[PDB]
Design an enzyme around this catalytic site. Structure first.
Site, PDB file in Angstrom:
ATOM      1  CB  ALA A 109      -0.917  -0.022   1.179  1.00 43.97           C
ATOM      2  CB  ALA A 138       5.382  -9.420   7.140  1.00 44.68           C
ATOM      3  N   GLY A 166       3.725  -3.325   6.250  1.00 43.84           N
ATOM      4  CA  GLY A 166       3.377  -1.967   6.629  1.00 43.84           C
ATOM      5  C   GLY A 166       3.143  -1.806   8.117  1.00 43.84           C
ATOM      6  CG  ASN A 218      -3.356   3.506  -4.895  1.00 42.22           C
ATOM      7  OD1 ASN A 218      -3.986   3.366  -3.848  1.00 42.22           O
ATOM      8  ND2 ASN A 218      -2.410   2.656  -5.283  1.00 42.22           N
ATOM      9  CG  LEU A 262       8.211  18.111   7.345  1.00 41.16           C
ATOM     10  CD1 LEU A 262       8.592  16.645   7.326  1.00 41.16           C
ATOM     11  CD2 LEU A 262       6.790  18.304   6.829  1.00 41.16           C
ATOM     12  N   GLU A 299       5.943  22.800  11.530  1.00 43.48           N
ATOM     13  CA  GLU A 299       4.711  23.579  11.459  1.00 43.48           C
ATOM     14  C   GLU A 299       3.487  22.674  11.403  1.00 43.48           C
TER      15      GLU A 299
HETATM   16  N1  LIG Z   1      -5.675   2.487  -0.652  1.00 40.76           N
HETATM   17  C1  LIG Z   1      -4.937   1.407  -0.905  1.00 40.76           C
HETATM   18  N2  LIG Z   1      -4.838   0.405   0.040  1.00 40.76           N
HETATM   19  C2  LIG Z   1      -4.093  -0.694  -0.208  1.00 40.76           C
HETATM   20  C3  LIG Z   1      -3.416  -0.840  -1.409  1.00 40.76           C
HETATM   21  N3  LIG Z   1      -2.762  -2.027  -1.373  1.00 40.76           N
HETATM   22  C4  LIG Z   1      -3.005  -2.621  -0.182  1.00 40.76           C
HETATM   23  N4  LIG Z   1      -3.836  -1.810   0.542  1.00 40.76           N
HETATM   24  C5  LIG Z   1      -4.358  -2.044   1.896  1.00 40.76           C
HETATM   25  O1  LIG Z   1      -3.318  -2.545   2.707  1.00 40.76           O
HETATM   26  C6  LIG Z   1      -3.830  -3.468   3.648  1.00 40.76           C
HETATM   27  C7  LIG Z   1      -2.909  -4.675   3.749  1.00 40.76           C
HETATM   28  O2  LIG Z   1      -1.572  -4.235   3.804  1.00 40.76           O
HETATM   29  P1  LIG Z   1      -0.582  -4.407   2.552  1.00 40.76           P
HETATM   30  O3  LIG Z   1       0.133  -3.112   2.257  1.00 40.76           O
HETATM   31  O4  LIG Z   1      -1.433  -4.828   1.379  1.00 40.76           O
HETATM   32  O5  LIG Z   1       0.436  -5.604   2.937  1.00 40.76           O
HETATM   33  P2  LIG Z   1       2.013  -5.359   3.184  1.00 40.76           P
HETATM   34  O6  LIG Z   1       2.266  -3.966   3.705  1.00 40.76           O
HETATM   35  O7  LIG Z   1       2.781  -5.596   1.905  1.00 40.76           O
HETATM   36  O8  LIG Z   1       2.481  -6.438   4.295  1.00 40.76           O
HETATM   37  P3  LIG Z   1       2.632  -8.024   4.001  1.00 40.76           P
HETATM   38  O9  LIG Z   1       1.578  -8.775   4.777  1.00 40.76           O
HETATM   39  O10 LIG Z   1       3.997  -8.484   4.447  1.00 40.76           O
HETATM   40  O11 LIG Z   1       2.484  -8.316   2.530  1.00 40.76           O
HETATM   41  C8  LIG Z   1      -5.216  -3.862   3.179  1.00 40.76           C
HETATM   42  O12 LIG Z   1      -6.156  -3.399   4.118  1.00 40.76           O
HETATM   43  C9  LIG Z   1      -5.444  -3.109   1.892  1.00 40.76           C
HETATM   44  O13 LIG Z   1      -6.734  -2.548   1.918  1.00 40.76           O
HETATM   45  C10 LIG Z   1      -3.508   0.163  -2.368  1.00 40.76           C
HETATM   46  O14 LIG Z   1      -2.917   0.053  -3.441  1.00 40.76           O
HETATM   47  N5  LIG Z   1      -4.273   1.282  -2.110  1.00 40.76           N
END
Ligand SMILES: Nc1nc2c(ncn2[C@@H]2O[C@H](COP(=O)(O)OP(=O)(O)OP(=O)(O)O)[C@@H](O)[C@H]2O)c(=O)[nH]1
Ligand SMILES: Nc1nc2c(ncn2[C@@H]2O[C@H](COP(=O)(O)OP(=O)(O)OP(=O)(O)O)[C@@H](O)[C@H]2O)c(=O)[nH]1
Ligand SMILES: Nc1nc2c(ncn2[C@@H]2O[C@H](COP(=O)(O)OP(=O)(O)OP(=O)(O)O)[C@@H](O)[C@H]2O)c(=O)[nH]1
Ligand SMILES: Cc1ccc(C(=O)NCc2cccnc2)cc1NS(=O)(=O)c1ccc(C2CC2)cc1
Ligand SMILES: Cc1ccc(C(=O)NCc2cccnc2)cc1NS(=O)(=O)c1ccc(C2CC2)cc1
Ligand SMILES: Nc1nc2c(ncn2[C@@H]2O[C@H](COP(=O)(O)OP(=O)(O)O)[C@@H](O)[C@H]2O)c(=O)[nH]1
Ligand SMILES: [Mg+2]
Ligand SMILES: [Mg+2]
Ligand SMILES: [Mg+2]
Ligand SMILES: [Mg+2]
Ligand SMILES: [Mg+2]
Ligand SMILES: [Mg+2]
Lengths: 429, 124, 423, 439, 428
Positions: free
Chosen positions: A11, A98, A145, A227, A249, A251
């Site tokens: 994401a 992960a 994430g 996105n 930043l 601010e």
């Molecule tokens: N807005 C938005 N949300 C996203 C996108 N891709 C994933 N998400 C959100 O991210 C959440 C899951 O986290 P991810 O970023 O997909 O997984 P990760 O950070 O790669 O972590 P891993 O489990 O190790 O793969 C879900 O709730 C999705 O809705 C995106 O392209 N746009």
């Protein structure tokens, strides 16, 4: 005073691409990295150089590092059509993710990988005459994430306590999500980076999905359509530092964040009109930011008291119109907390907002983004805390985290902290 | 509509103001201690599993061992039971024939005393 | 790129494993010699998960074939896709298992389990990042059940951090190979609770029942039974085999589908069951129907803990999503409340051969305790009288292993029901 | 690999081995000179027929068999028969004096003279096998050789080959076509000593086989080869899945595991269908069901006992010819509904099936008609306790007066062996009764 | 294999013995010169059991204390076929003195008898045993015969000993002491033979006189009967089939108790030598007449006792199914005359080749409790003489003591007692 962007997880990376895509067309930078409107070749101290450094050949390179433990998403940037802009160094990938597991991203593999990404950050930081801090983009629910971002955030504070850290986080939405352990991952990562982030702009994936469907007349929006709308809201927030209000930043911390823990301001954006006419009032777009239908996080601002708020206009806006626009809205009685002055910090940027050519959202004469630290955002926390509690009551799924070396006590050490944050929110509410 | 506006930073493509409507630690070794404590308990989990798998390896050895014992015990008891009855059958059969031929010898000796008696009768 | 090592063990395991390879090879456009002949790069984007790039321009399945007798593995080499499997990946013995779990797991299986692992290690070194293993086998026989669980235990010893998944054919009197099937199944159910991360429960009773009743065949062929399994396995594995919005692996699904380590037994489902493409509303309806469950359990007798559904073919995903939450909202009481959003779906616009549209059901339902209850009643019926028990004692086994395995399986039934009445 | 050594003991066992190996040769197309014009692999190769045959350098295909009799007349015709060149002369072993219908002479006085010589030729054939499966021991119960020597051989095999699998094919005593009054003695004594040494014993009696040939072939009195050549079909049907490539096999260990619920309960009776005369040969063929239904009819049991009088503990159905699993499963399905066919409550599955696609063949010019399909059922039912009781009663009539016991005592036996043997047969009768009561 | 050594002792032993060689040699197509001249090849497959191939020579040993009989058997037809070395004679007969044959003059030449026995047994591939023809009424065949039997068992204890013993009858010889010599022989026979065929001269006289309607029978008339049954008893010994020509087998199946090995032979049809035979008896006629008391070779009525075991041999071209039906019919039409505690105690054999002149014939060998009638009569005459101890000094003069006589009559009295015990024995 330069600024470094970090995208962790799918994401964070995909959103990050969508943001850098708009930065280039806003500043008229071309995919090969050239900028025909940049005459101090290879150097300078312009406003847009807070986010791009310059080659010897004139290519404009984003001050960004892309981190994911799986390479499918980064491989896109590695091979995409905006591929020339980054050096192979800026893109970091392991090859096992992960597994939607916070503890796997934090305790297990993150121990193996953070020294690498930290080294790549210092190489970019060493390319900074003055550097205010970092913008980290990450999801709450994903393993990478969640787990790795939290590990990176604390290391970033002991390494660069000097600087400031801003978050662009994705709130898990039941309609648009990928894992049932996302309430677990969210509660865990906010607890451990709360002390290490100055401001955190969270994004409720359901709200945008609702925004694009109603306002764009779209069937079910792709992630790319999500996105691209995010990119408009991020760009307006970061626009202040890209055209040197909100030019520092700190601010952000000072204007919108009165105490440390309460650093989750609500973001709102208007207008959003399909590419499928002549523009609407300055008071029309300003009035829309107070309608909950345009909010980024689904919550009721009427149920909350504002502590501070920030209005960044972009386009053909002059002060007399907003003063007039912000005179009429005071004809919704929006209460504020009694230790903070009722009022609005206002910033204007005269160049119209840009759009991806061919995108669904139309090009507009004037746009506005309101950033308000309301206590109404606490209800978004409350929904997350409840779903966490339902599964943790039966201790469902926690064997996956304990199997990675995480103590079960971290679940409630993080959960009680969330209880304090929700309680602290209504203490000033 | 009285609003104390304050004209702040202003320049070529930007300006800003604030309208008012109403007035009113970091330790890395402690970090890596958490990371290492998680890694060590993972190793404790791996060790306890590997110990559990060792007892199942040993159980497979014990099961295969007693299977060998059952086959070996079956062989030698069959060997000894066959030897016991074959030897006991020999003594039985030999005793039967030895008895039958001793009576036959007794019968022979009686024929010689019959002949002896007649010769002493002939001396009359 | 995140490879999977496949192992087929025993009579059943080798024969449904052979049809699985023939079916997905057809989906990926790979012919008997192993060279690509399909029409789209989509068949090749994730082909390394199940295949190895051969010396020339061919693809070799990362598959190991195991049996204690050379009979059926020779017949799969005689099959149309017989020449595709690596020749050094055929690991066979001559002793056989005699339909005896003890011979497979202890005495005879030990004489071969080292050579099989040597092949496992070989292909493991041939992977950039091995995610785990999948095993096809039955539980009723001797080799697949007995030697299969022994192999799974020794694989976990060597690769403890990797994922282990099994496709386990549960024995049934309607289609049986031997009379001691209650023993062999009970003895290895005990083992699947400990040493696999998830197990797909293929019930020969459900297979036969489905094959007979709703498909109207006087009496079903073995190919008919296996056809259901291969189509079911094909659908269970599409996201691993085809690209999409998500990069699905083994561990994520396990992390999301298994809330507690022991309850990792899944109820597979498929729709439609074929011997006029279907509308998205009808697939989601029949896919949740008891008559489409490859395990002989009624889902309305239990509550779904977690559910994953896979749709294939050209369709609108809002149709899919609305329908999937429709039945979720229509039957609110058959899902557990303490796991919010416990039904997630995925769509891959490439359908299987012979169908424009289809759907696959992977359910973690506590109604599956009816499966282990059926086996436990047949087990006690024999074990009460200690019938046929002397063929297991003669191999060094003791009676307490039978009772340990029996009460462990009843323990699994108990705690499945525990979360059935959980609020 | 997976070889099997056949040992034929006594006149009954040898002449049954004549019929079987003649039938094996016709099924595999092995000429009377030993040469098989359908095996490309000269002097070797491991095809499926090689489980029962070895190959020489010259191509001769020799049976993995040993023929042993304490008396040479019956084996002499094997040495002079049409198939004389099939065996190396060392495979046919004969003494010069038979056991004279005396178990003691076969097991003790006369049998000890050739027992080691027999055992060492078993070891040499076993030396030529990379993976020995087990032994098939053919013998009658009534003769001195068939009872006394077989028991001695079975005990020796257990010593030399451990718990390796030993399966028997035995002819049960029948007054109607009997040959010796002391048959009840020999049968009880041999059963008592080979009990712990045999893994499973397929059983027929010449009475039921005699009546079947009379009834279904219209023979006023069937000769011994009539009985033998019908028995050869039963034996070949048992060994079909080991000599032919087959979809569903039943190896020596599979017979054991599936037919023997308890160590002492290892006496399944044979059954066979169809049995059709050659003169009314080619009318419309019988179903796959019909021949399966025939196996459960009391008139067709190769041991004259009534299955309606007992419960089934295990049923092995071995099909050959034009039959596929779906036909068998359906035929079994409706048999599972038949209320007259009853199973014990401790065997819920109860069935084991092997299938071979090769068609059954018969010796040309015989009385039996060649058929497209055939099945042999090996049933372990409590109903054969009747057969044990019949034999044990005849034993009781003579042992009460000690009649003929002097012939056994004279050869070294004790009267204690007689009571031990019978007491164990009384326990076997009780065991068959005890496993039949409900749980 | 299975060679049989035949011995004939005394007048009667050599007379019926020479007649028995006459019958089977013609059955086996061997002329008095001794060379095969037979039509079929079944005649020489089991020829080695009784004949030694040198020209085939009978494996026979001819013994007598009286030297004149040697020249009598040679002078008879088939006289030159016997080997001359096989003749063993003494200086003069025993004069009906059992002690002379068994203990004194008989013991002188018994060493020379065992010489040729050894010589003939050494040339045997696998010796079955010995058969002895002799009478029990005289002194040589009875006294020395029984001594020969016990001598032979000393050298061959595991070999079968069978005898064809002719019991004395007052209807054919008025010699007073023959009851003594028979009782002393029976005393020997009960312990030292595996089976003896009890050929009663009393029965032989009744058949020729009452049935054959013969004026004054000549020993030739009586011996025609014995030679007919003797050939019929040994048919399966001399001819092949699915049946093994064995001695131990028959003895094991026919002798339930060691002492009860005295058989009642029967024959059908009874016929004179020159009879015309206008028709061939059919199977039901043979089977019913075979079990008839008129066809018994021992003066015993089978319906005064019960059959322990019965072996029957049919001769000629007939249906084996018919044989089974008739043999089973008389078994349960007279079920009371077969002990129930020996199941299937009646088994029969059929051979395709019939005797000379008769196309249909049947031979009967039954182990009957009714044979106690024969021993009762001999004991009755014995105790009558021994009560007054008549003529005892003829025997005690040779060295015998009187208590041998007491043991012989007691043991014979035990034999009749043992037959009667099993006659009324119940299944339970
Ligand atoms: N807005 C938005 N949300 C996203 C996108 N891709 C994933 N998400 C959100 O991210 C959440 C899951 O986290 P991810 O970023 O997909 O997984 P990760 O950070 O790669 O972590 P891993 O489990 O190790 O793969 C879900 O709730 C999705 O809705 C995106 O392209 N746009
Ligand atoms: N089916 C069948 N039964 C036979 C055959 N030959 C003999 N029998 C039976 O076998 C039993 C007798 O045993 P045999 O095999 O003849 O005797 P043996 O093994 O040679 O023993 P001895 O001759 O006493 O040394 C009786 O039940 C006979 O009916 C035969 O060829 N076929
Ligand atoms: N049936 C039959 N009986 C005979 C014949 N010859 C003699 N006997 C009987 O034999 C009895 C007498 O015994 P023998 O055989 O003559 O005397 P032996 O054996 O030669 O002994 P000694 O003459 O005393 O030296 C008499 O009772 C006769 O009835 C014969 O040819 N046929
Ligand atoms: C949604 C989904 C459906 C199918 C597959 C798929 O087919 N994977 C390939 C594979 C892997 C292993 C074995 N067989 C096949 C993957 C996913 N995505 S998910 O994140 O893993 C996930 C999240 C949440 C849940 C439920 C608790 C609500 C389930 C799955
Ligand atoms: C059936 C038969 C008929 C004749 C002969 C035959 O003539 N044998 C040659 C010989 C040997 C010795 C003396 N004379 C002749 C042999 C047999 N078969 S049998 O096994 O011996 C046997 C078994 C059971 C019984 C039972 C009724 C009690 C009787 C006989
Ligand atoms: N569905 C299916 N089941 C099978 C097949 N073959 C055997 N079985 C079942 O598998 C079990 C017997 O195991 P099997 O594989 O033959 O024994 P193994 O060789 O020792 O592993 C029984 O439950 C049979 O019903 C098959 O080809 N397909
Ligand atoms: Mg990811
Ligand atoms: Mg510049
Ligand atoms: Mg024999
Ligand atoms: Mg070959
Ligand atoms: Mg099999
Ligand atoms: Mg004289």
């Amino acid at each position: 005073r330069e600024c470094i962007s970090i995208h962790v997880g799918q994401a964070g990376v995909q959103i990050g691409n969508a943001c850098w895509e708009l930065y280039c067309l806003e500043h008229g930078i071309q995919p090969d990295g050239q900028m025909p409107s940049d005459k101090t070749i290879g150097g300078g101290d312009d406003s847009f150089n807070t986010f791009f450094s310059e080659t010897g050949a004139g290519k404009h390179v984003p001050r960004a590092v892309f981190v994911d433990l799986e390479p499918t998403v980064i491989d896109e940037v590695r091979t995409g059509t905006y591929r020339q802009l980054f050096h192979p160094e800026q893109l970091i990938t392991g090859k096992e993710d992960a597994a939607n597991n916070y503890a796997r991203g934090h305790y297990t593999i993150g121990k193996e990988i953070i020294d690498l990404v930290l080294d790549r950050i210092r190489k970019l930081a060493d390319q900074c005459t003055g550097l205010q801090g970092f913008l980290v983009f990450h999801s709450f629910g994903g393993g990478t994430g969640s787990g790795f971002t939290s590990l990176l955030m604390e290391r970033l504070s002991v390494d660069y306590g000097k600087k400031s850290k801003l978050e662009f986080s994705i709130y898990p939405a039941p309609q648009v999500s990928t894992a049932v352990v996302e309430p677990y991952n969210s509660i865990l990562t906010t607890h451990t980076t709360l002390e290490h982030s100055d401001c955190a702009f969270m994004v409720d994936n359901e709200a945008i999905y609702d925004i694009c469907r109603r306002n764009l007349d779209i069937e079910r929006p792709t992630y790319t359509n999500l996105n691209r709308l995010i990119s408009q809201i991020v760009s307006s927030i970061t626009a202040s530092l890209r055209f040197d209000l909100n030019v520092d930043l700190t601010e952000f911390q000072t204007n919108l964040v009165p105490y440390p823990r309460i650093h989750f301001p609500l973001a709102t954006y208007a207008p959003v009109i399909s590419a499928e006419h002549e523009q609407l009032s300055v008071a029309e777009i300003t009035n829309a930011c107070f309608e909950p239908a345009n909010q980024m996080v689904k919550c009721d601002p009427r149920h909350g008291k504002y502590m501070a708020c920030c209005l960044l206009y972009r386009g053909d806006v002059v002060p007399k119109d907003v003063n007039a626009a912000i005179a009429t809205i005071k004809t919704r009685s929006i209460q504020f907390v009694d230790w903070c002055p009722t009022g609005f910090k206002v910033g204007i940027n005269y160049q119209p907002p840009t759009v991806v050519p061919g995108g669904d959202l139309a090009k507009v004469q004037r746009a506005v983004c309101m950033l308000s630290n309301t206590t109404a955002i606490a209800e978004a926390w409350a929904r997350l805390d409840h779903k966490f509690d339902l599964m943790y009551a039966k201790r469902a799924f926690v064997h996956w985290y304990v199997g990675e070396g995480m103590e079960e006590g971290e679940f409630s050490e993080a959960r009680e902290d969330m209880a304090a944050l929700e309680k602290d929110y209504e203490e000033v509410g | 509509a009285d609003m104390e506006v304050i004209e702040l930073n202003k320049c070529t493509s930007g300006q800003s103001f604030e309208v008012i409507l109403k007035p009113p630690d970091p330790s890395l070794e402690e970090i890596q201690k958490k990371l290492e404590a998680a890694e060590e308990r993972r190793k404790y989990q791996e060790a306890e599993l590997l110990k559990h798998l060792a007892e199942k390896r040993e159980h497979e050895r014990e099961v295969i061992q007693k299977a060998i014992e059952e086959n070996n015990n079956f062989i030698k008891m069959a060997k000894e039971k066959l030897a016991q009855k074959m030897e006991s059958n020999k003594e039985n059969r030999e005793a039967h024939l030895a008895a039958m031929l001793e009576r036959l010898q007794e019968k022979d000796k009686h024929a010689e005393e019959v002949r002896k008696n007649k010769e002493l009768k002939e001396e009359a | 790129m995140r490879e999977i090592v496949h192992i087929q063990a025993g009579q059943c395991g080798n024969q449904i494993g052979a049809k699985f390879w023939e079916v997905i090879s057809d989906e990926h456009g790979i012919d008997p010699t192993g060279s690509y002949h399909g029409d789209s790069d989509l068949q090749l984007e994730r082909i390394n998960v199940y295949y190895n790039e051969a010396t020339g321009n061919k693809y070799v399945p990362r598959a190991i074939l195991v049996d204690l007798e050379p009979g059926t593995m020779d017949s799969v080499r005689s099959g149309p896709f017989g020449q595709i499997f690596r020749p050094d990946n055929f690991v066979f013995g001559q002793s056989g298992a005699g339909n005896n779990w003890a011979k497979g797991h202890y005495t005879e299986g030990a004489e071969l389990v080292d050579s099989v692992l040597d092949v496992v290690r070989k292909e493991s070194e041939s992977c950039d990042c091995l995610q785990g293993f999948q095993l096809t086998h039955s539980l009723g026989g001797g080799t697949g059940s007995g030697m299969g669980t022994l192999l799974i235990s020794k694989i976990r010893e060597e690769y403890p951090d990797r994922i282990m998944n099994t496709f386990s054919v549960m024995p049934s009197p309607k289609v049986s190979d031997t009379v001691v099937e209650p023993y062999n199944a009970t003895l290895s159910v005990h083992q699947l609770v400990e040493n696999t991360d998830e197990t797909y429960c293929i019930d020969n009773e459900a297979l036969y029942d489905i094959c007979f009743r709703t498909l109207k065949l006087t009496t079903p062929t073995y190919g008919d039974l296996n056809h259901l399994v291969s189509a079911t396995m094909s659908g269970v594995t599409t996201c691993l085999r085809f690209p999409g919005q998500l990069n699905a692996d083994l561990r994520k699904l396990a992390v999301n589908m298994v809330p507690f380590p022991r309850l990792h037994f899944f109820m597979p489902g498929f729709a439609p069951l074929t011997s006029r493409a279907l509308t998205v509303p009808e697939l989601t309806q029949q896919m949740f129907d008891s008559k489409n469950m490859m395990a002989a359990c009624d889902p309305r007798h239990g509550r779904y803990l977690t559910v994953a559904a896979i749709f294939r073919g050209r369709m609108s995903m809002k149709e899919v999503d609305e329908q999937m939450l429709n039945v979720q909202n229509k039957n609110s009481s058959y899902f557990v409340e303490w796991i919010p959003n416990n039904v997630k779906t995925a769509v891959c616009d490439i359908p299987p051969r012979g169908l424009k549209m289809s759907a696959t059901f992977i359910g973690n339902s506590t109604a599956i305790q009816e499966l282990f209850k059926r086996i436990s009643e047949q087990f006690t019926a024999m074990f009460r009288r200690k019938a046929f028990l002397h063929w297991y004692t003669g191999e060094g086994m003791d009676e307490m292993e039978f009772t340990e395995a029996e009460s462990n399986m009843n323990d699994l039934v108990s705690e499945y029901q525990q979360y059935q009445d959980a609020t």
